[PDB]
Each structure stands twice: as structure tokens, then as C-alpha cells.
């Protein structure tokens, strides 16, 4: 209980850096990168018992995942990858690992001041996406 209280709420994207390069490293094709890179998603996080739900809503896609920490699940990503995901809490940071086709990417979500900071890493390439409360 209360594990993720500081994450819960509705958040809006305010800045993004290096997302196109992250998407390239992931393998996202040109047209999807252009459209996805323009998106300004909201992220809606809620908790009910042990189940965490994260929704991303934008003009590009609406996606939703529900999960229990440490318990793998299958996810179709906004760019249409079919991945195996596991999300854990590490020292207050939500750590989301996606595995597919022998590849891996990790997305970390953390609270910093009044922001929710999302760091997406694929090999040597990081993108930082900053959200504020809606």
C-alpha cells in the first residue's frame, strides 16, 4: 500500500530530448518516428491494491498497461512492438524493462520536484521526457 502515491495522477508532457535518436535505436521506422515524436501525451497513473495502471493518451495512440510489480506481462507498444515487460520499484524509481527479438530497453520513471521524469534508454542512447501535473 501507498507504494506509488507520488506517481498517481494525470501528467502532461512538457519537454522531450533525444527521443528521435532513442526511437531510431529501438528500430522505429521513419513515419512512426515523425508522428510519435510530435505527440504530446498525457500519462495517467493509478493504483488499486497491488495493480498499477499507466495510460498514455495522445493524438498518436492511446495505450494502457496494468501490472503488478515484479510480475512479467505482455505489452504492445505504441510503435507496435510485441514485448515482454517487467516493472519493479528500485529505490523509489519505477523501472520498466521491455524485451523483444533479443533486444532490451529500459524506461525509468521518477518524481523530481513537481515533475515526473521519464528516462528511456536503448544501449548507449538516452531520451529524457519531462511531465508536469495536468
Sites of contact with ligand RG6 (CB under 6 A): 23, 26, 28, 36, 39, 41, 56, 58, 60-61, 77-79, 107, 120
Question: Quick one: 23 or 52, whose CB is closer to Cl ion?
Answer: 23
Residues making contact with Cl ion (CB under 5 A): 16-17, 19
111 is in an annotated binding site: no
Question: Quick one: 22 or 67, whose CB is closer to Cl ion?
Answer: 22
131 is in an annotated binding site: yes
**Which of the listed partners (ligand RG6, Cl ion, none) does 16 bind, with a CB threshold of 5 to 8 Å by partner kind?**
Cl ion
Distance CA 71, CA 22 (A): 26
Task: Provide the grid cell at 102.
Answer: 533479443
Question: Quick one: 49 or 124, whose CB is closer to ligand RG6?
Answer: 124
For the bound state, the minimum distance from the C-beta of residue 7 to ligand RG6, rounded and expressed in Å, comes to 14
For the bound state, the minimum distance from the C-beta of residue 62 to ligand RG6, rounded and expressed in Å, comes to 9
HEC secondary structure over the chain: CCCCHHHCEEEEEEEEECHHHHHHHHCCCHHHHHHHHHCCCEEEEEEECCEEEEEEECCCCEEEEEECCCCCEEEECCCCCEEEEEEEEECCEEEEEEEECCEEEEEEEEEECCEEEEEEEECCEEEEEEEEEC
Do the Cβ atoms of 115 and 129 come closer than 8 Å? no
**Which of the listed partners (Cl ion, ligand RG6, none) does 79 bind, with a CB threshold of 5 to 8 Å by partner kind?**
ligand RG6
Q: What are residue 88's DSSP bridge partners? A: 95
For the bound state, the minimum distance from the C-beta of residue 101 to ligand RG6, rounded and expressed in Å, comes to 13
Q: Which residues are annotated as a binding site?
A: 129-131
Amino acid at each position: 500500500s501507498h507504494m506509488c502515491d507520488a506517481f498517481v495522477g494525470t501528467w502532461k508532457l512538457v519537454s522531450s530530448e533525444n527521443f528521435d535518436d532513442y526511437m531510431k535505436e529501438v528500430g522505429v521506422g521513419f513515419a512512426t518516428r515523425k508522428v510519435a515524436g510530435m505527440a504530446k501525451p498525457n500519462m495517467i497513473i493509478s493504483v488499486n491494491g497491488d495493480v498499477i495502471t499507466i495510460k498514455s493518451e495522445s493524438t498518436f495512440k492511446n495505450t494502457e498497461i496494468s501490472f503488478i510489480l515484479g510480475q512479467e506481462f505482455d505489452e504492445v507498444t505504441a510503435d507496435d512492438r510485441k514485448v515482454k515487460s517487467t516493472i519493479t520499484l528500485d529505490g523509489g524509481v519505477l523501472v520498466h524493462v521491455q524485451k523483444w527479438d533479443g533486444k532490451s530497453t529500459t524506461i525509468k520513471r521518477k518524481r523530481e520536484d513537481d515533475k515526473l521524469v521519464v528516462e528511456c534508454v536503448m544501449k548507449g542512447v538516452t531520451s529524457t521526457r519531462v511531465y508536469e501535473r495536468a
